[PDB]
Amino acid sequence: HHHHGSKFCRFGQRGQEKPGIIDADGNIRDLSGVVPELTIDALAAAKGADIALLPLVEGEPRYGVPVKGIGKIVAIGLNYEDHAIESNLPIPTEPMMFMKALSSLNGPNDEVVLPKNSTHGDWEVELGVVIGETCRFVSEDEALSKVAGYVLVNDVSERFNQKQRGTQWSKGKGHDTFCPVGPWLVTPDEVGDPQDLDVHLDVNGERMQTGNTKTMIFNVAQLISYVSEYITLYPGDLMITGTPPGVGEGKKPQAIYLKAGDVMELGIEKLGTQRQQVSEWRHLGDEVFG
Amino acid sequence: SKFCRFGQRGQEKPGIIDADGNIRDLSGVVPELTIDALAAAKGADIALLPLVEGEPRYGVPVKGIGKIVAIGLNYEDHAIESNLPIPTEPMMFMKALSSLNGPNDEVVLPKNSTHGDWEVELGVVIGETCRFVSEDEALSKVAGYVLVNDVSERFNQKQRGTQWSKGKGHDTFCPVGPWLVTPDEVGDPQDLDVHLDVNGERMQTGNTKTMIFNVAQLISYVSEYITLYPGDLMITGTPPGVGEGKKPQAIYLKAGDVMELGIEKLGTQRQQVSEWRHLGDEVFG
Ligand SMILES: [Mg+2]
Ligand SMILES: [Mg+2]
Ligand SMILES: [Mg+2]
């Protein structure tokens, strides 16, 4: 096990994904000969593989969620100081927590389907944290050692369902397709300091969110430590750590929201990029996502 | 039919309750008690099944619960008692999957907790994908019903922000079971007696008839905001009598307490309550 870090992915159509690793040239390398699936338990074997000996993946396959078996998704509310200032909101003394319904999980470039009658759809680029070891009353000093890696996330939100149908945010957060995750699970040795990564999100090519994780209010270690006093985080769990300024709900003089045909493009330094096309609601039938 | 899972945590086997109340081993028919296994388990010849020996622990009666959707205020008599208005749509929050526990398993209070509280609830286990389902079709998506205790920490729930889930996801705070009872045996889910005792003293008494949104209304509403997949658990609120609302003063859980609860046709739970300790590397559920 080396100390240079890895970028893992899962590639292929839904339900048929295969484990992979990104080489220095940006190619996917097939890990199927080393591990059957990219799970948290598979990482030890995957982290020891010799990239040079792995076959190049031909074509341009779909990226899936980069880790299989995410058990639950814990989400943070206000957590960027420059966002608090732009919204004129108090700096919290403890993190706001809510749950992102697992059924919202989707691949990084998968279509975003607006829910019924949605005119308040909104974007939130966030740093995601994938847990590698159980977190139960973990101190700040030991929190980051529990991390399997980092992932890019869009915490897609329906602001009417989130705030105008009661006080509980999860009602506007759990819609099918509202949590695209990926394209890479990037292990800590490759990310470096998670509190110094540039963040952005564009809509139809126009820059909406710009930030850097150095303005996080609670850093990753403090979030993991705090959350672990209220819920146990298990290997494979995902924590999404909040969003920088520039959400559509906060635009001035009037809020700006998603519409059918919009294109979101987002990225975080070291974590790759996502692109989602937004569609009007349709009945998704018996399809399973994630 | 009443299905169960028996044995030590992480080692449970699938079972069915026979006419005498004894557990019979289903392992010769299905390897696990999953939603996909129910048809084969329901269609099995109970006489072929061996009696389970010893008095084994009951586990969560269904394997593979993917997520737990919880309902807020949902009993008309509870709303009246608390002097709260009747909600016009159900409050939803998520009950952390890691709170899942066996029906009779120890309940560990969180660190320095003085606001631990009880909530007997009817649980609904989903059998078929629910995505924008009509009220008329909702009950047909149900695999079975289960007894639940929506254990809560009222200070974490209400005094650390506006989101209730922070006081509801603690380890051990969702005892589920002992039986997954299929709808044919339960009959009308809106005519079930409900009760919870603490140290043998009756705390909660009710009947599901007073639900504000019934199971079909809840499934239909929830399915417009979050897709329910087979194996998902919906917990549908609690009748009056929670410790938070006791008068002249609220009463909360303490180390040494014993909770005993039951819902008609769904069996009974008994939990001993303990003060906090670090639970190590244990994986609950
Ligand atoms: Mg967010
Ligand atoms: Mg007996
Ligand atoms: Mg409840």
Coordinates of C-alpha atoms and ligand atoms in Angstrom, one line a residue:
Chain A
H1 CA 0.0 0.0 0.0
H2 CA 1.6 3.2 -1.3
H3 CA 1.2 6.8 -0.1
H4 CA 0.5 8.5 -3.5
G5 CA -3.3 8.1 -3.6
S6 CA -5.7 6.7 -6.1
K7 CA -8.7 7.8 -8.2
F8 CA -11.3 5.0 -8.3
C9 CA -14.4 4.8 -10.4
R10 CA -17.1 2.4 -11.6
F11 CA -17.9 2.4 -15.4
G12 CA -20.6 0.9 -17.5
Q13 CA -24.4 1.0 -17.8
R14 CA -26.6 0.9 -14.7
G15 CA -26.5 -2.4 -12.9
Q16 CA -23.5 -3.5 -15.0
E17 CA -20.8 -1.3 -13.7
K18 CA -17.2 -2.5 -13.4
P19 CA -14.4 -1.3 -11.1
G20 CA -11.8 1.1 -12.4
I21 CA -8.9 3.4 -11.6
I22 CA -7.9 6.6 -13.4
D23 CA -4.3 6.8 -14.7
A24 CA -2.2 9.9 -15.1
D25 CA -3.4 10.4 -18.6
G26 CA -7.1 10.4 -17.7
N27 CA -7.8 6.9 -19.0
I28 CA -9.9 4.4 -17.1
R29 CA -8.0 1.2 -16.3
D30 CA -10.0 -1.9 -15.7
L31 CA -9.7 -3.4 -12.2
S32 CA -11.9 -6.4 -12.8
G33 CA -8.8 -8.7 -12.7
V34 CA -7.9 -7.5 -9.2
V35 CA -11.3 -6.9 -7.5
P36 CA -14.8 -7.9 -8.7
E37 CA -16.5 -4.7 -7.5
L38 CA -15.4 -1.3 -6.2
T39 CA -16.6 -1.6 -2.6
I40 CA -15.0 -0.2 0.5
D41 CA -13.7 -3.7 1.4
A42 CA -12.2 -4.0 -2.1
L43 CA -10.0 -0.9 -1.5
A44 CA -7.1 -2.7 0.1
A45 CA -6.6 -4.9 -2.9
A46 CA -7.4 -2.1 -5.3
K47 CA -4.9 0.3 -3.6
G48 CA -2.2 -2.3 -4.1
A49 CA -2.7 -2.8 -7.9
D50 CA 0.0 -1.9 -10.4
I51 CA -1.7 0.6 -12.7
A52 CA 0.7 -0.2 -15.6
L53 CA -0.4 -3.8 -15.7
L54 CA -4.1 -2.9 -16.0
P55 CA -5.9 -2.9 -19.4
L56 CA -7.1 0.4 -20.9
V57 CA -10.8 0.7 -21.1
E58 CA -11.8 1.5 -24.7
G59 CA -14.7 3.7 -25.7
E60 CA -16.3 6.3 -23.5
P61 CA -18.4 4.3 -21.0
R62 CA -20.8 5.9 -18.5
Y63 CA -19.5 6.6 -15.1
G64 CA -21.6 5.2 -12.3
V65 CA -21.5 6.1 -8.6
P66 CA -17.8 5.4 -7.9
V67 CA -18.3 3.2 -4.9
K68 CA -20.8 0.4 -4.5
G69 CA -22.7 0.0 -1.2
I70 CA -23.3 3.5 0.1
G71 CA -25.6 2.8 3.0
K72 CA -26.8 6.2 3.8
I73 CA -26.1 9.9 3.1
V74 CA -25.8 12.5 5.9
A75 CA -25.9 16.1 4.7
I76 CA -24.9 19.4 6.3
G77 CA -26.8 22.7 6.1
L78 CA -25.1 26.2 6.1
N79 CA -21.3 25.5 6.2
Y80 CA -19.5 28.2 4.1
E81 CA -18.6 31.5 5.8
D82 CA -19.0 33.5 2.5
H83 CA -22.4 31.8 2.0
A84 CA -23.5 33.0 5.5
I85 CA -22.4 36.5 4.6
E86 CA -24.1 36.5 1.2
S87 CA -27.4 35.3 2.8
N88 CA -27.0 37.4 6.0
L89 CA -27.4 34.3 8.1
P90 CA -25.8 33.6 11.5
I91 CA -22.6 31.5 11.7
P92 CA -24.0 28.3 13.3
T93 CA -22.6 27.1 16.6
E94 CA -23.3 23.5 15.6
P95 CA -23.8 21.9 12.2
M96 CA -27.3 21.6 10.8
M97 CA -27.8 18.0 9.8
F98 CA -30.4 16.4 7.6
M99 CA -30.6 13.1 5.7
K100 CA -30.4 12.9 1.9
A101 CA -32.6 10.0 0.9
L102 CA -30.5 7.1 -0.5
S103 CA -33.0 6.8 -3.4
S104 CA -31.7 10.2 -4.7
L105 CA -28.2 8.7 -5.4
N106 CA -27.2 8.8 -9.0
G107 CA -24.2 8.6 -11.3
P108 CA -22.3 11.8 -11.8
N109 CA -23.4 12.7 -15.3
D110 CA -26.9 11.1 -15.1
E111 CA -30.0 13.0 -16.1
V112 CA -31.7 15.1 -13.4
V113 CA -35.5 14.7 -13.6
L114 CA -37.4 17.6 -12.0
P115 CA -40.2 16.4 -9.7
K116 CA -43.9 17.2 -10.4
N117 CA -44.7 20.9 -10.8
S118 CA -41.2 21.9 -9.9
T119 CA -40.4 25.6 -10.4
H120 CA -37.9 25.8 -7.5
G121 CA -35.2 23.3 -8.5
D122 CA -31.8 24.4 -7.4
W123 CA -28.1 23.4 -7.5
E124 CA -25.5 22.9 -4.7
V125 CA -22.0 21.8 -5.5
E126 CA -20.5 20.1 -2.5
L127 CA -17.5 18.2 -1.2
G128 CA -18.5 14.6 -0.4
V129 CA -16.7 12.4 2.1
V130 CA -16.8 8.6 1.9
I131 CA -16.3 6.8 5.2
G132 CA -13.8 3.9 5.3
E133 CA -13.9 3.0 9.0
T134 CA -16.7 3.1 11.6
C135 CA -17.2 6.6 13.2
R136 CA -18.7 6.5 16.6
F137 CA -17.9 9.3 19.0
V138 CA -14.7 10.0 17.1
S139 CA -12.5 12.9 18.1
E140 CA -11.5 15.7 15.7
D141 CA -7.9 14.5 16.0
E142 CA -8.7 11.1 14.7
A143 CA -11.6 11.9 12.3
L144 CA -9.7 12.1 9.0
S145 CA -8.1 8.7 9.4
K146 CA -11.6 7.2 9.1
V147 CA -12.0 8.6 5.6
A148 CA -11.9 6.3 2.5
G149 CA -11.8 9.2 0.1
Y150 CA -13.5 12.2 -1.3
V151 CA -16.2 12.6 -4.1
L152 CA -17.8 15.4 -6.0
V153 CA -21.5 15.9 -5.3
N154 CA -24.4 18.0 -6.5
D155 CA -27.0 18.3 -3.6
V156 CA -29.9 19.1 -6.0
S157 CA -32.7 20.7 -4.1
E158 CA -36.4 21.5 -4.6
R159 CA -36.7 24.7 -2.5
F160 CA -40.5 24.7 -2.4
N161 CA -40.7 21.1 -1.2
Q162 CA -37.7 21.7 1.1
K163 CA -39.1 24.8 2.9
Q164 CA -42.8 25.5 2.0
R165 CA -44.3 22.0 2.9
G166 CA -43.1 22.0 6.5
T167 CA -39.8 22.6 8.4
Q168 CA -38.0 19.4 7.4
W169 CA -35.6 19.9 4.6
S170 CA -35.4 16.2 3.5
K171 CA -38.8 16.5 1.8
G172 CA -37.2 18.6 -0.9
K173 CA -33.8 16.7 -1.0
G174 CA -34.7 13.1 -1.6
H175 CA -36.2 13.2 -5.1
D176 CA -35.1 10.6 -7.6
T177 CA -31.9 11.8 -9.4
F178 CA -31.2 14.6 -6.9
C179 CA -27.8 13.3 -5.7
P180 CA -25.3 12.8 -8.6
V181 CA -22.1 11.5 -7.1
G182 CA -18.7 11.1 -8.8
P183 CA -17.0 10.6 -11.1
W184 CA -14.1 9.5 -8.8
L185 CA -13.5 8.3 -5.3
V186 CA -10.3 10.0 -4.6
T187 CA -8.3 8.7 -1.7
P188 CA -6.8 11.2 0.9
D189 CA -3.2 10.9 -0.3
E190 CA -4.1 12.2 -3.7
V191 CA -6.6 14.9 -2.5
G192 CA -4.1 16.4 0.0
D193 CA -5.7 19.0 2.3
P194 CA -9.5 18.9 1.9
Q195 CA -9.7 22.4 3.3
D196 CA -7.9 23.9 0.3
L197 CA -9.8 22.9 -2.9
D198 CA -11.4 25.2 -5.5
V199 CA -15.1 24.7 -6.1
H200 CA -17.4 25.7 -9.0
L201 CA -20.7 25.2 -10.7
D202 CA -22.0 26.6 -14.0
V203 CA -25.5 26.6 -15.4
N204 CA -25.8 26.9 -19.2
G205 CA -22.2 27.9 -19.3
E206 CA -22.6 30.8 -16.9
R207 CA -20.8 30.7 -13.6
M208 CA -23.2 30.4 -10.6
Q209 CA -21.1 29.1 -7.7
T210 CA -17.4 29.9 -7.0
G211 CA -15.6 29.0 -3.8
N212 CA -12.9 27.2 -2.0
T213 CA -13.2 24.8 0.9
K214 CA -10.9 27.0 3.0
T215 CA -14.0 29.0 3.9
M216 CA -15.8 26.0 5.4
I217 CA -17.2 26.8 8.8
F218 CA -16.8 23.3 10.2
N219 CA -14.0 21.5 8.6
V220 CA -14.3 17.8 7.5
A221 CA -12.8 16.5 10.7
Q222 CA -15.0 18.6 12.9
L223 CA -18.1 17.5 10.9
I224 CA -17.2 13.8 11.2
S225 CA -16.5 14.2 14.9
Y226 CA -19.8 16.1 15.6
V227 CA -22.1 13.8 13.4
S228 CA -20.6 10.7 15.0
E229 CA -22.1 11.7 18.4
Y230 CA -25.7 11.6 16.9
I231 CA -25.4 8.9 14.2
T232 CA -22.9 6.2 13.7
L233 CA -21.2 6.4 10.3
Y234 CA -20.3 3.0 8.8
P235 CA -17.9 2.1 5.9
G236 CA -19.3 3.3 2.7
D237 CA -21.5 6.1 4.2
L238 CA -21.4 9.4 2.4
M239 CA -21.3 12.8 4.1
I240 CA -22.0 15.9 2.0
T241 CA -20.5 19.0 3.6
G242 CA -22.5 22.0 2.3
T243 CA -22.2 24.4 -0.5
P244 CA -20.4 27.7 -1.3
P245 CA -22.3 30.9 -2.2
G246 CA -24.3 31.2 -5.5
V247 CA -27.2 28.9 -5.2
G248 CA -30.2 30.0 -7.4
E249 CA -32.4 30.6 -4.3
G250 CA -30.0 33.4 -3.3
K251 CA -29.7 35.3 -6.6
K252 CA -30.4 39.0 -6.6
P253 CA -32.6 40.8 -7.4
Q254 CA -34.7 37.7 -7.9
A255 CA -34.1 34.0 -7.3
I256 CA -33.2 31.9 -10.3
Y257 CA -34.2 28.2 -10.6
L258 CA -33.7 25.2 -12.8
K259 CA -35.9 24.6 -15.9
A260 CA -36.2 21.7 -18.3
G261 CA -33.3 21.8 -20.8
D262 CA -30.8 23.5 -18.3
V263 CA -27.3 22.0 -18.1
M264 CA -25.3 22.0 -14.9
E265 CA -21.5 21.6 -14.9
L266 CA -19.5 21.5 -11.7
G267 CA -16.2 20.5 -10.3
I268 CA -13.9 20.4 -7.3
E269 CA -10.1 20.5 -7.6
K270 CA -8.7 16.9 -7.6
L271 CA -12.2 15.3 -7.8
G272 CA -13.1 15.7 -11.5
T273 CA -16.2 17.1 -13.0
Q274 CA -19.9 16.5 -13.5
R275 CA -22.4 17.4 -16.2
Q276 CA -26.2 16.9 -15.8
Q277 CA -29.0 17.7 -18.2
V278 CA -32.3 18.7 -16.5
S279 CA -35.6 17.3 -17.7
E280 CA -39.2 17.9 -16.9
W281 CA -41.0 15.4 -14.7
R282 CA -42.0 12.0 -16.1
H283 CA -43.1 8.8 -14.4
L284 CA -39.9 6.9 -14.0
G285 CA -41.7 3.6 -13.8
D286 CA -40.0 0.7 -12.0
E287 CA -36.5 2.0 -12.7
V288 CA -33.9 1.8 -9.9
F289 CA -31.1 4.4 -9.8
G290 CA -28.0 4.7 -7.7
Chain B
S1 CA -48.4 -15.4 8.3
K2 CA -45.9 -14.0 10.9
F3 CA -42.3 -14.1 9.8
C4 CA -39.2 -13.5 12.0
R5 CA -35.4 -13.7 12.1
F6 CA -33.8 -15.5 15.1
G7 CA -30.3 -15.8 16.5
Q8 CA -27.5 -13.6 17.5
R9 CA -26.8 -10.3 15.7
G10 CA -25.2 -10.9 12.3
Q11 CA -26.1 -14.6 12.4
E12 CA -29.9 -14.6 12.2
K13 CA -31.8 -17.3 10.4
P14 CA -35.3 -17.0 8.7
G15 CA -38.3 -18.2 10.7
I16 CA -42.1 -18.4 10.8
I17 CA -44.4 -18.5 13.8
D18 CA -46.5 -21.6 13.9
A19 CA -50.0 -22.0 15.3
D20 CA -48.7 -22.8 18.8
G21 CA -46.5 -19.7 18.8
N22 CA -43.3 -21.6 18.3
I23 CA -40.5 -20.6 15.8
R24 CA -40.0 -22.9 12.9
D25 CA -36.8 -22.8 10.8
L26 CA -37.3 -21.6 7.2
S27 CA -33.6 -22.2 6.2
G28 CA -34.5 -25.3 4.2
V29 CA -36.9 -23.2 2.1
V30 CA -35.1 -19.8 1.8
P31 CA -31.6 -18.8 2.9
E32 CA -32.8 -15.4 4.3
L33 CA -36.0 -13.6 5.1
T34 CA -36.0 -10.9 2.4
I35 CA -39.0 -9.3 0.6
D36 CA -38.0 -11.4 -2.4
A37 CA -38.2 -14.5 -0.2
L38 CA -41.7 -13.9 1.1
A39 CA -43.6 -15.7 -1.6
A40 CA -41.6 -18.9 -1.2
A41 CA -41.7 -18.5 2.6
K42 CA -45.5 -17.9 2.5
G43 CA -45.9 -20.9 0.2
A44 CA -43.9 -23.3 2.4
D45 CA -45.4 -26.3 4.2
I46 CA -44.9 -25.4 7.9
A47 CA -45.2 -29.1 9.0
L48 CA -42.0 -29.8 7.0
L49 CA -40.1 -27.1 9.1
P50 CA -38.2 -28.1 12.3
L51 CA -38.9 -26.5 15.6
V52 CA -36.3 -24.1 16.7
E53 CA -34.6 -25.2 19.9
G54 CA -33.5 -23.0 22.7
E55 CA -35.2 -19.6 23.2
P56 CA -33.2 -17.6 20.6
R57 CA -33.1 -13.8 20.3
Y58 CA -35.4 -12.2 17.8
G59 CA -33.7 -10.0 15.2
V60 CA -35.2 -7.4 12.9
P61 CA -37.8 -9.6 11.2
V62 CA -36.8 -8.5 7.6
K63 CA -33.3 -8.5 6.2
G64 CA -32.3 -5.7 3.8
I65 CA -34.2 -2.7 5.0
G66 CA -32.7 0.1 2.7
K67 CA -34.0 3.2 4.5
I68 CA -36.6 4.3 7.1
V69 CA -39.1 7.1 6.4
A70 CA -40.7 8.5 9.6
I71 CA -43.9 10.5 10.0
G72 CA -44.3 13.4 12.5
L73 CA -47.5 14.3 14.3
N74 CA -50.1 11.8 13.0
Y75 CA -52.7 11.0 15.7
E76 CA -55.8 13.2 16.1
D77 CA -55.9 12.5 19.8
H78 CA -52.2 13.3 20.1
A79 CA -52.7 16.7 18.4
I80 CA -55.6 17.5 20.7
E81 CA -53.6 16.5 23.8
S82 CA -50.7 18.7 22.7
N83 CA -53.0 21.5 21.6
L84 CA -51.5 21.5 18.2
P85 CA -53.3 22.1 14.9
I86 CA -54.1 19.2 12.6
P87 CA -51.3 19.1 9.9
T88 CA -52.5 19.5 6.3
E89 CA -49.7 17.3 5.0
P90 CA -47.6 14.8 6.9
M91 CA -44.3 15.8 8.3
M92 CA -41.6 13.5 7.0
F93 CA -38.1 13.0 8.4
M94 CA -35.6 10.3 7.9
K95 CA -34.9 7.7 10.7
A96 CA -31.2 6.9 10.3
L97 CA -30.8 3.3 9.2
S98 CA -28.0 2.8 11.8
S99 CA -30.7 3.2 14.6
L100 CA -32.2 -0.1 13.5
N101 CA -32.2 -2.7 16.2
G102 CA -33.8 -6.0 17.3
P103 CA -37.2 -5.8 19.1
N104 CA -35.9 -6.8 22.5
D105 CA -32.4 -5.4 22.2
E106 CA -30.9 -3.1 24.8
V107 CA -31.6 0.7 24.3
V108 CA -28.4 2.7 25.0
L109 CA -29.1 6.3 25.9
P110 CA -26.8 8.9 24.2
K111 CA -24.0 10.6 26.1
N112 CA -25.4 12.8 29.0
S113 CA -28.9 12.2 27.7
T114 CA -31.7 13.5 30.0
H115 CA -34.5 13.8 27.4
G116 CA -34.8 10.2 26.1
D117 CA -38.3 9.4 25.2
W118 CA -40.6 6.6 23.8
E119 CA -42.9 6.4 20.8
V120 CA -44.7 3.2 19.9
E121 CA -45.6 3.2 16.2
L122 CA -47.1 1.0 13.5
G123 CA -44.3 0.1 11.0
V124 CA -45.1 -0.6 7.3
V125 CA -42.7 -2.7 5.3
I126 CA -42.9 -2.0 1.6
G127 CA -43.2 -4.9 -0.8
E128 CA -43.4 -3.2 -4.2
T129 CA -41.8 0.0 -5.5
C130 CA -43.9 3.1 -4.6
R131 CA -43.4 5.9 -7.1
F132 CA -46.3 8.4 -7.4
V133 CA -48.8 5.8 -6.2
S134 CA -52.5 6.6 -5.8
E135 CA -54.2 6.3 -2.4
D136 CA -56.4 3.6 -4.0
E137 CA -53.4 1.4 -4.9
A138 CA -51.1 2.1 -2.0
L139 CA -52.1 -0.7 0.4
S140 CA -51.4 -3.2 -2.4
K141 CA -47.7 -2.2 -2.2
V142 CA -47.3 -3.3 1.4
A143 CA -45.4 -6.5 2.3
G144 CA -46.4 -6.5 5.9
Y145 CA -46.6 -4.7 9.2
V146 CA -44.2 -4.5 12.1
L147 CA -44.1 -3.1 15.7
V148 CA -41.7 -0.2 16.1
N149 CA -40.4 2.0 19.0
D150 CA -39.4 5.4 17.5
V151 CA -37.0 6.1 20.4
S152 CA -36.2 9.8 20.6
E153 CA -33.9 12.3 22.3
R154 CA -36.1 15.4 22.6
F155 CA -33.2 17.8 23.3
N156 CA -31.3 16.6 20.2
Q157 CA -34.5 16.6 18.3
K158 CA -35.7 20.1 19.0
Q159 CA -33.0 22.2 20.7
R160 CA -30.1 21.7 18.3
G161 CA -31.8 23.1 15.2
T162 CA -35.0 22.7 13.3
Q163 CA -34.4 19.2 11.9
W164 CA -35.8 16.3 14.0
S165 CA -33.5 13.6 12.6
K166 CA -30.7 14.7 14.9
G167 CA -32.6 13.4 17.9
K168 CA -33.8 10.2 16.2
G169 CA -30.9 8.4 14.6
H170 CA -28.9 7.3 17.7
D171 CA -27.6 3.8 17.9
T172 CA -30.4 1.4 19.3
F173 CA -33.2 4.0 18.8
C174 CA -35.3 2.0 16.3
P175 CA -36.3 -1.4 17.7
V176 CA -38.3 -3.3 15.0
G177 CA -40.2 -6.5 15.4
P178 CA -40.6 -9.3 16.5
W179 CA -42.8 -10.2 13.5
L180 CA -43.4 -9.1 10.0
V181 CA -47.1 -9.8 9.7
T182 CA -48.6 -10.1 6.3
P183 CA -51.6 -7.9 5.4
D184 CA -54.0 -10.9 5.3
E185 CA -53.4 -11.6 9.0
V186 CA -53.4 -7.9 10.1
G187 CA -56.7 -7.0 8.4
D188 CA -57.5 -3.4 8.6
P189 CA -54.4 -1.5 9.7
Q190 CA -56.6 1.4 10.9
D191 CA -58.2 -0.7 13.6
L192 CA -55.3 -1.9 15.8
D193 CA -54.9 -1.3 19.5
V194 CA -51.6 0.3 20.6
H195 CA -49.8 0.5 23.9
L196 CA -46.5 1.3 25.6
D197 CA -45.6 0.8 29.3
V198 CA -42.5 2.1 31.2
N199 CA -41.6 0.0 34.3
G200 CA -45.0 -1.6 34.0
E201 CA -46.9 1.7 34.2
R202 CA -49.0 2.5 31.2
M203 CA -47.8 5.5 29.3
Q204 CA -49.2 5.3 25.8
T205 CA -52.7 4.0 24.9
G206 CA -54.3 4.4 21.5
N207 CA -55.7 2.9 18.4
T208 CA -54.6 3.4 14.8
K209 CA -58.2 4.5 14.0
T210 CA -57.3 8.0 15.1
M211 CA -54.4 8.4 12.6
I212 CA -54.6 11.8 10.8
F213 CA -53.2 10.3 7.5
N214 CA -53.8 6.6 7.3
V215 CA -51.3 4.2 5.8
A216 CA -52.6 4.5 2.3
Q217 CA -52.6 8.3 2.5
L218 CA -49.1 8.3 3.9
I219 CA -47.7 5.9 1.2
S220 CA -49.3 8.0 -1.6
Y221 CA -48.0 11.3 -0.2
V222 CA -44.4 10.0 0.5
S223 CA -44.1 8.4 -2.9
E224 CA -44.3 11.9 -4.6
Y225 CA -41.1 13.1 -2.8
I226 CA -39.1 9.9 -2.2
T227 CA -39.3 6.5 -4.0
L228 CA -39.9 3.6 -1.6
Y229 CA -38.3 0.4 -2.7
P230 CA -39.1 -3.2 -1.5
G231 CA -37.8 -3.6 2.0
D232 CA -38.1 0.1 3.0
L233 CA -39.7 0.8 6.3
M234 CA -42.2 3.5 7.0
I235 CA -43.0 4.4 10.6
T236 CA -46.3 6.2 10.9
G237 CA -46.3 8.3 14.1
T238 CA -47.4 7.7 17.7
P239 CA -50.6 8.1 19.9
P240 CA -50.7 10.4 22.9
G241 CA -48.7 9.6 26.0
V242 CA -45.0 10.3 25.1
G243 CA -42.9 11.4 28.1
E244 CA -42.4 14.8 26.6
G245 CA -46.0 15.7 27.2
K246 CA -46.6 14.3 30.7
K247 CA -48.1 16.7 33.2
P248 CA -47.4 18.4 35.6
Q249 CA -43.8 17.7 34.4
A250 CA -42.3 15.8 31.4
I251 CA -40.9 12.4 32.2
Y252 CA -37.9 11.0 30.4
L253 CA -36.0 7.7 30.2
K254 CA -33.2 6.9 32.7
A255 CA -30.8 4.0 33.1
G256 CA -32.6 0.9 34.5
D257 CA -36.0 1.7 32.8
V258 CA -37.8 -1.1 31.0
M259 CA -40.0 -0.3 28.1
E260 CA -42.8 -2.8 27.1
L261 CA -45.0 -2.1 24.1
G262 CA -47.3 -3.8 21.7
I263 CA -49.7 -3.4 18.8
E264 CA -52.6 -5.8 18.3
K265 CA -51.6 -8.7 16.0
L266 CA -48.0 -7.5 15.8
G267 CA -46.5 -9.0 19.0
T268 CA -44.6 -7.2 21.8
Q269 CA -41.3 -5.6 22.6
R270 CA -39.3 -5.3 25.8
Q271 CA -36.2 -3.1 26.0
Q272 CA -34.0 -2.5 28.9
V273 CA -32.6 1.1 29.0
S274 CA -28.9 1.7 29.8
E275 CA -26.8 4.7 30.3
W276 CA -24.3 5.7 27.6
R277 CA -21.2 3.8 26.9
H278 CA -18.9 3.7 23.9
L279 CA -20.3 0.8 21.8
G280 CA -17.0 0.1 20.1
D281 CA -17.1 -1.5 16.6
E282 CA -20.5 -3.0 16.9
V283 CA -22.7 -2.9 13.8
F284 CA -26.4 -2.8 14.7
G285 CA -29.4 -3.7 12.7
Ligands
MG1 MG -26.5 21.0 0.6
MG2 MG -42.3 -19.9 23.2
MG3 MG -42.3 9.1 15.7

